[PDB]
């Protein structure tokens, strides 16, 4: 089997991407944030505290003939941005792009933090990291990908995120029309439950490539590119008037600037992030200070190749017995 679904930016900055997902029978379509940095499939639901719902589409298990309570199971998750959610668990039929899993754990939110409530466009998350991070207790549950894997034509999914445009998530096949050149594969460590890999270095603009190992995760659920402070300082030093602002919470730059590109290494291959991908626009409406898309990871504990980096590539998440990541230009 295969699946193919279009993923759409939630706003003009590409802050996140939503993908329609069918849950239950008859189908209830919710728009979920596919997150390669977490492992829970959770939704706004008929159980979510009413004051915490503001425009999201909800899953109502009582209207699904295939829903079953997963008795006794609860979940609770906290993300890197400080957001959180928790609840109980149903199993139900879930389809993405024509690929169906029966018996998928659908984590029904009873509580969500303010950042979720305030984002009316995101109806929940679909985690695609390794199932070792799934938070369901007392019986940990599998991701949609892990449940689909054995049925897929190839045990892979691909992320092809757009810059200010829709893109695609494919399951079970690699669309050889979707990228240019060849795919460079690199090793993955699953020790922390993430798609963790080591970049071979970086360049700023037309500068020389610096060979240096940068361990980090491929995380579709993170907007920006978070890298070591040395690398980030080297990038923003090439932008007149850029500075790190403790008041704003990262590097800002004059909105009048033209940003240089950023290149990262994948083995001997190179992915180039155009400068415009690094512009996240005014820090507040009408400001002439703009927020940078490359930020320090110093306060995180891990480097994160988020959407700024991933949308410059066609990315293969190879879930074979020995997982690997692949990157191609596009």
**Cα-atom radius of gyration of the chain, to the nearest Å?**
20
* CATH class of the domain defined by 175-330: mainly beta
Parallel, antiparallel or unpaired: strands 17-23 and 28-35: antiparallel
Q: Which of 35, 88, 123, 279 is catalytic?
A: 35
Q: What are the distances in angstroms from CA 176 to CA 63, 167, 198, 259?
A: 40, 15, 25, 31
Which H, E and C letters describe the chain, residue by residue?
CCEEEEEEECCCCCCCEEEEEEECCCCEEEEEEEECCCCCEEECECCCCHHHCCCCCCECHHHCCCCEEEEEEEEEEECCCCCEEEEEEEEEEEEECCEEEEEEEEEEEEEECHHHHHCCCCCEEEECCCHHHCCCECCCCCCHHHHHHHHCCCCEEEEECCCCCCEEEEECCCCCCCCCCCCEEEECECCCCCCEEEEEEEEECCCCCEEEEEEEEECCCCCCEEECHHHHHHHHCCCCCCEEECCCCEEEEECCCCCCCEEEEECCEEEEECHHHHEEEECCCCCCEEEECEEECCCCCCEEECHHHHCCCEEEEECCCCCEEEEECC
Structure token pair of residue 191: 């020790």
Structure token pair of residue 47: 């159980």
Whether 83 is catalytic is no
Resolution in A: 1.0
| Cα–Cα distance for residue pair 266/140, rounded to 1 Å | 33
CATH 2.40.70.10 domain range(s) in the chain: 5-174, 175-330
Residue with the two structure tokens 């003009």 = 12
Asked if the bond preceding 208 is cis, omega within 30° of 0, the reply is no
Contact yes or no for 66/25 (Cβ under 8 A): yes
Contact yes or no for 324/315 (Cβ under 8 A): no
Q: Which of 199, 261, 296, 297 is catalytic?
A: 199
Residue with the two structure tokens 């699946």 = 3
CA 84 to chain centre: 16
| Cα–Cα distance for residue pair 195/149, rounded to 1 Å | 16
CA 295 to chain centre: 17
What is the experimental method?
X-ray
| Cα–Cα distance for residue pair 239/224, rounded to 1 Å | 18
Structure token pair of residue 141: 């549950």
Contacts of 315 (CB under 8 A, 6+ apart): 158, 159, 160, 218, 325, 326, 327
Q: Put residue 21 in one of left, alpha, beta given phi > 0 → left and psi -120 to 50 → alpha.
A: beta
Structure token pair of residue 80: 């890197």
Contact yes or no for 86/77 (Cβ under 8 A): yes
Q: What are the distances in angstroms from CA 35 to CA 75, 143, 169?
A: 17, 11, 11
5-174: CATH, from 3.20.20.190, 3.40.50.300, 2.40.37.10, 2.40.70.10? 2.40.70.10
Contact yes or no for 293/285 (Cβ under 8 A): no
Return phi, psi of residue 209, to 5°: -75, 130
| Cα–Cα distance for residue pair 264/209, rounded to 1 Å | 9
Whether 35 is catalytic is yes
């Amino acid at each position: 089997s295969t699946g193919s679904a279009t993923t759409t930016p939630i706003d003009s900055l590409d802050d996140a991407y939503i993908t329609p997902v069918q849950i239950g029978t008859p189908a209830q379509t919710l728009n979920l944030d596919f997150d390669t940095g977490s492992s829970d499939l959770w939704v706004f639901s008929s159980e979510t505290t009413a004051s915490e719902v503001d425009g999201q589409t909800i899953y109502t298990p009582s209207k699904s003939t295939t829903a079953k309570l997963l008795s006794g199971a609860t979940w609770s998750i906290s993300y890197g941005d400080g957001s959180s959610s928790s609840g109980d668990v149903y199993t139900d039929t879930v389809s993405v792009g024509g690929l169906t899993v029966t018996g998928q754990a659908v984590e029904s939110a009873k509580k969500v933090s303010s950042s979720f409530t305030e984002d009316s466009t995101i109806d929940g998350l679909l985690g695609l990291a390794f199932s070792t991070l799934n938070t369901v207790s007392p019986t940990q549950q599998k991701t949609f990908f892990d449940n689909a894997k054995a049925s897929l034509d190839s045990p892979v999914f691909t992320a092809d995120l757009g810059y200010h445009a829709p893109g695609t998530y494919n399951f079970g096949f690699i669309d050889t029309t979707a990228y240019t050149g060849s795919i460079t594969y690199t090793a993955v460590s699953t020790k922390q439950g993430f798609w963790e890999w080591t970049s071979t270095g970086y360049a700023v603009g037309s500068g020389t490539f610096k060979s240096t190992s940068i361990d980090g995760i491929a995380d579709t659920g993170t907007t920006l590119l978070y890298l070591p402070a040395t690398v980030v300082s080297a990038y923003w030093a090439q932008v007149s008037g850029a500075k790190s602002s403790s008041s704003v919470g990262g590097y800002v730059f004059p909105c009048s600037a033209t940003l240089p590109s950023f290149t990262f290494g994948v083995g001997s291959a190179r992915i180039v992030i155009p400068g415009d991908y690094i512009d996240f626009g005014p820090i507040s409406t009408g400001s002439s200070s703009c927020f940078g898309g490359i930020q320090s990871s110093a306060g995180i504990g891990i480097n994160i190749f988020g959407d700024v980096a991933l949308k410059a590539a066609f990315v293969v998440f190879n879930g074979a017995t020995t997982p690997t990541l692949g990157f191609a230009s596009k």
